[PDB]
């Protein structure tokens, strides 16, 4: 199937019509998405099949065809871009200065941007176009607003 690097929609025909359940990143022959998008199920790309290779429910990440390849990190100072891919809508870049999630095990960057659930898996980029994490696992704060972690895996 199609293996060109880039951002892709994750679709299903199981429900009414064709529904977008999320998004992912193809890089170096491996497809990266969030675990809550596919629940570790196999994927189709044209006539080809993509099998899961690594996954972890707590990190909320999964890779297909090979190990996790994305290793760039937010520098803690600069603005970033969410390359949002909303259901039924064109891919669009949104620039923002991330906030912080402070946890008992360290700090993580966070993006205060609200998009439909089917946008989960959209990549967050630095000024060099490198993917520093995926959008879509976060929290709903006091005023009902949505704040996503900048979720990044480990490159073995």
């Amino acid at each position: 199937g199609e293996t060109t690097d880039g951002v892709y929609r994750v679709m299903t025909r199981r429900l009414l019509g064709s529904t977008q359940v999320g998004v992912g990143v193809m890089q170096e022959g491996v497809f990266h998405t969030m675990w809550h998008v596919t629940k570790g199920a196999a994927l189709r790309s044209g006539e080809g099949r993509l099998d899961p290779y690594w996954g972890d429910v707590k990190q909320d990440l999964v890779s297909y065809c090979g190990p996790w390849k994305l290793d760039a990190a937010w520098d803690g100072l600069s603005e970033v871009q969410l390359l949002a891919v909303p259901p039924g809508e064109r891919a669009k870049n949104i620039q923002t200065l991330p906030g912080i999630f402070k946890t008992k095990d360290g700090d993580i960057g966070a993006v205060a941007l609200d998009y439909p659930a089917g946008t989960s898996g959209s990549p967050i980029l630095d000024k060099c176009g490198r993917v520093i994490g995926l959008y879509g696992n976060g929290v709903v704060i006091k005023n009902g607003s949505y704040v996503s972690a900048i979720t990044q895996g480990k490159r073995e």
Binding site: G24, L43, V85, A91, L97, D105
Partner: protein, 39 residues
């Protein structure tokens, strides 16, 4: 049965729409991968 469809290249767009705030939040992460607020 899930399938993928290309949506674009991954590139920084010069002069993109700039929005969103930068909140500093105390959070907890459980074994199921759910983030929650800590107060």
């Amino acid at each position: 049965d899930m399938y993928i469809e290309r949506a674009g290249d991954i590139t920084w767009e010069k002069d993109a729409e700039v929005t969103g705030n930068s909140p500093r939040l105390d959070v907890a992460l459980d074994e199921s991968g759910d983030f929650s607020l800590v107060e």
